[PDB]
Amino acid sequence: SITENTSWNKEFSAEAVNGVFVLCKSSSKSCATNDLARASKEYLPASTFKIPNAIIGLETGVIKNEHQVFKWDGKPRAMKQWERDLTLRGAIQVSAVPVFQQIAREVGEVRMQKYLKKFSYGNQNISGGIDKFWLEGQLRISAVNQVEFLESLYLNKLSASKENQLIVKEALVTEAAPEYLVHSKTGFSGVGTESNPGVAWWVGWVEKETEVYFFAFNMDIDNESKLPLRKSIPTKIMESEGII
C-alpha cells in the first residue's frame, strides 16, 4: 500500500528536481510518497547495491568476516579515497567501487543471480559484466523495492545468517544520536547522457524511540553539483515529520 502525499513536492519543485521519496513507518506495508508512479519505477541502483553485495559476499565466504581488511594493491583507483586499505564499513562508507567489483567477481554470476532472486532485488538482471551490472548494466530497482529490502534486512529476514545481516547493518550506520540511529547508503550512477539523466540515491532506515522508519529517495541528475540534494531534500522531509 502506497499513499501519495502532496505536502512533499514542495521540497522538489523548490529545487527544480524530478525525483521521489518513499517513507514508511513501522513497516513497508504502509508507505507515503510524493509520486505514486515514480515510487515504483525501477532505476539503476548504483552504489546502493553495495548493501546486497556485502551480504552476499559474507554469505558466500568471499568476505571472511566483519574484520576482513581489503588491501589496496597500490594500483590507481578512480577516487583517491579508495587508494588505501579498507574495512567493510570503510569500503561501504567511501563507496569503494573496486573493492565491491572484486567481491562481485569472486561471488560469480551463478551465486549472484541466486541471491538477487532470494532477496527479490528489483528486476534481478545482472547481465552486462559481473563487475559492473549495478553501475552500467540492466539491473533496476524501485524506491519501494528498496524499502522492502531494507525492512527484511532490519528484521533479519533475508536469506542469510543473522550474523551477516547484523554485520552489514552496523556497517551502514551513518548517524548516531541519543534518541535515534540512522542506517543508510548513498548512490550515484553518473550524469547520464543527453535526454537520459543519471540517478542519485539515498536509502536506509531510522530507528527512533521504539519506532522504525524505512526510506528511499532517488532523483534524476545531470550535474554532479546537484548531488547534495539527494540528502538535503529527504532530510528536510524527515525533519518536518519529526523523525530526525
Question: Distance (Å, rounded) from C-alpha 99 to C-alpha 86?
Answer: 9
Question: Distance (Å, rounded) from C-alpha 184 to C-alpha 201?
Answer: 10
Which of 181, 221, 238, 243 is in the footprint of a copy of itself by CB under 8 A?
A: 181
201 binds Ca ion (CB under 5 A): no
**Considering CB distances under 5 to 8 angstroms, the limit depending on partner class, which of Ca ion, a copy of itself, none binds residue 117?**
none
Closest to 41 in 3D by CA, of 214, 201, 182, 195: 201
**Considering CB distances under 5 to 8 angstroms, the limit depending on partner class, which of a copy of itself, Ca ion, none binds residue 210?**
a copy of itself
175 binds a copy of itself (CB under 8 A): yes
Which listed range, 16-24, 53-61, 121-129, 186-194, lies at the site for Ca ion (CB under 5 A)?
A: 186-194
How many angstroms separate the Cα of 85 from the Cα of each of 14, 99, 191? 41, 10, 28
Which listed range, 54-62, 79-87, 113-121, 223-231, lies at the site for a copy of itself (CB under 8 A)?
A: 79-87
Question: Distance (Å, rounded) from C-alpha 181 to C-alpha 147?
Answer: 17
* Per annotation, catalytic residue among 47, 142, 184, 189: 47
Which of 67, 73, 193, 196 is in the footprint of a copy of itself by CB under 8 A?
A: 67
49 binds Ca ion (CB under 5 A): no
Which listed range, 5-13, 33-41, 161-169, 189-197, lies at the site for a copy of itself (CB under 8 A)?
A: 161-169
Kindly provide the residue ranges of all beta strands, DSSP E only, lying in the chain, ordered along the sequence: 2-4, 19-25, 31-33, 42-43, 141-142, 173-176, 180-188, 192-193, 196-208, 211-221
51 binds a copy of itself (CB under 8 A): no
Sign of CA dihedral 63, 65, 66, 67: negative
100 binds Ca ion (CB under 5 A): no
Give the footprint of a copy of itself on residues 127-156 (CB under 8 A).
155
Q: What angle do CA 185, 186, 190 make, to 5 degrees?
A: 150
Active site residues: 47
